[PDB]
Design a protein around this ligand. Sequence first.
Ligand SMILES: Cc1cc2nc3c(=O)[nH]c(=O)nc-3n(C[C@H](O)[C@H](O)[C@H](O)COP(=O)(O)OP(=O)(O)OC[C@H]3O[C@@H](n4cnc5c(N)ncnc54)[C@H](O)[C@@H]3O)c2cc1C
Ligand SMILES: Cc1cc2nc3c(=O)[nH]c(=O)nc-3n(C[C@H](O)[C@H](O)[C@H](O)COP(=O)(O)OP(=O)(O)OC[C@H]3O[C@@H](n4cnc5c(N)ncnc54)[C@H](O)[C@@H]3O)c2cc1C
Ligand SMILES: COc1cc(OC)c2c(c1)c(C)cc(=O)n2C
Ligand SMILES: COc1cc(OC)c2c(c1)c(C)cc(=O)n2C
Ligand SMILES: [Zn+2]
Ligand SMILES: [Zn+2]
Lengths: 230, 230
Amino acid sequence: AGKKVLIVYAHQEPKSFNGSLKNVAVDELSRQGCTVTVSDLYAMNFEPRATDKDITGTLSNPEVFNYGVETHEAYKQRSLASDITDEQKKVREADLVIFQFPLYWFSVPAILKGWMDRVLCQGFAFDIPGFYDSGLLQGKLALLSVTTGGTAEMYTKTGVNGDSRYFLWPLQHGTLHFCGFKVLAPQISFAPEIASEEERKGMVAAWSQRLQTIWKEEPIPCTAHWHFGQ
Amino acid sequence: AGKKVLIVYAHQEPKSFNGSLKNVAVDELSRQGCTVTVSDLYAMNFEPRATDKDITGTLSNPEVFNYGVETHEAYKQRSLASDITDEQKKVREADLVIFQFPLYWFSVPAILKGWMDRVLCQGFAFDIPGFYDSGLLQGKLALLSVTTGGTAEMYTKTGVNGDSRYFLWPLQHGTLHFCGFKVLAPQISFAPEIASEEERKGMVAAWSQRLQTIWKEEPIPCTAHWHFGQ
Ligand SMILES: Cc1cc2nc3c(=O)[nH]c(=O)nc-3n(C[C@H](O)[C@H](O)[C@H](O)COP(=O)(O)OP(=O)(O)OC[C@H]3O[C@@H](n4cnc5c(N)ncnc54)[C@H](O)[C@@H]3O)c2cc1C
Ligand SMILES: Cc1cc2nc3c(=O)[nH]c(=O)nc-3n(C[C@H](O)[C@H](O)[C@H](O)COP(=O)(O)OP(=O)(O)OC[C@H]3O[C@@H](n4cnc5c(N)ncnc54)[C@H](O)[C@@H]3O)c2cc1C
Ligand SMILES: COc1cc(OC)c2c(c1)c(C)cc(=O)n2C
Ligand SMILES: COc1cc(OC)c2c(c1)c(C)cc(=O)n2C
Ligand SMILES: [Zn+2]
Ligand SMILES: [Zn+2]
């Protein structure tokens, strides 16, 4: 406060561990006096497909469809579909975007992948130039709050899954850094379903505590070295 | 000769460079006498979202929906939605699965992510235990055939994007090897929008040429070292 937060939330069940994490984030950020908005993608039936329906009116080139060029032209000419533009208005206003999701195949669920693909379009989130340190959402913070089915030990460099930082790369680097975000340290809640009824409260109460001082945090160095190195 | 190939194809435009790559694969593998099937996800309006619509029977826990528990039970009972079981039959029959797509945010387009999320369910593609070298699709081969906006140089260890292998990890390892596939070396067709008409022709031809001998190939060692070094 005075800060705005967008929580993009991708879980089907409000009673889930993910739902609890989204709800404590709203509760704690609302208590601090921050402005809070939640894009509840499943409840919204959010469209994940990148298709020519994302441009309204008439196309730059209706013989050969190029999603990147069409949506770039459409963002410049204010003719993107209203579900996209609604989400761009949220992100444009936000000082922090928190993604809350269960890890699906070492990445985001498809409905959230579709939000990244369709809302983070050229002209809005990035351009030539304006990417990585210079991306168009520069100034803004982003944070992945991810839950996993695999344990922390599975997610080490010599573990069956590799270090968590390895799967973070396309999300933190290739997507958030790329668009300009400073990335806060991910919040990774390992294997909640196998944890006890408390312990899970440890993790929820722990995210609420972290959120108390989120605006004091320095963003990680979003480097190949941070992700893979020594 | 006597092999079955599934191509899971994710591009909106038949006239695109991805479209040319898919078509050359069909032409060359058809020429060789292989059995070929293509799942053209956008033309199928393939559903990417993981929702409770994917199970048609009585849920195990209708009070608190857990997509992974409900779909595992649905797969064992034969009560998954038919679009999913349609794709599982194609995968079960295939000896090789080629994924043909443009790189979206260092990953697959969300329509293809939802193919992975919904088709590769517990019981069918993996079980716990029954993953990585014990995954249920053991015996099968997979190959990612990717196109990029970024040049090969941008995709090297000291380029901006980092090495191309780094973005392959959640797909090759976290998804395909997790399900028991052996993974053939990726086909990466760099920056075809930047390339001349000639260089594009050569990249289509280079893919066709590689497919002539694809059944002679051995898979990669799908480890942390192969992807990251050290
Ligand atoms: C398609 C698919 C792909 C996947 N791919 C991967 C992958 O690549 N890698 C991987 O590691 N995992 C993967 N998973 C597993 C997935 O990441 C986990 O199942 C998910 O992260 C668990 O979080 P949840 O909210 O769904 O858990 P929940 O099951 O909702 O949480 C566990 C328990 O906590 C309860 N709970 C709710 N709120 C609270 C609270 N206030 N305090 C205490 N308990 C609470 C729940 O109701 C439940 O009993 C995959 C799953 C699917 C379906
Ligand atoms: C949401 C989104 C996210 C993206 N994220 C990334 C990313 O993370 N990293 C990245 O590097 N890129 C990214 N891109 C760029 C994208 O990967 C490239 O635009 C795409 O890979 C290029 O493939 P295409 O088929 O669309 O090319 P096209 O534009 O179709 O192909 C280039 C040219 O080749 C022509 N062609 C077709 N067939 C032939 C043929 N037989 N012979 C000669 N020429 C032919 C086409 O007609 C066209 O003129 C992103 C794009 C979008 C829209
Ligand atoms: C596809 O669904 C799942 C479910 C899981 O556990 C529930 C998984 C995974 C995938 C992967 C890729 C790694 C892992 O460690 N675990 C535990
Ligand atoms: C998000 O859309 C795009 C479009 C591109 O090029 C057309 C990109 C990228 C993303 C990324 C992340 C890296 C890159 O090198 N290129 C060239
Ligand atoms: Zn980075
Ligand atoms: Zn592997």
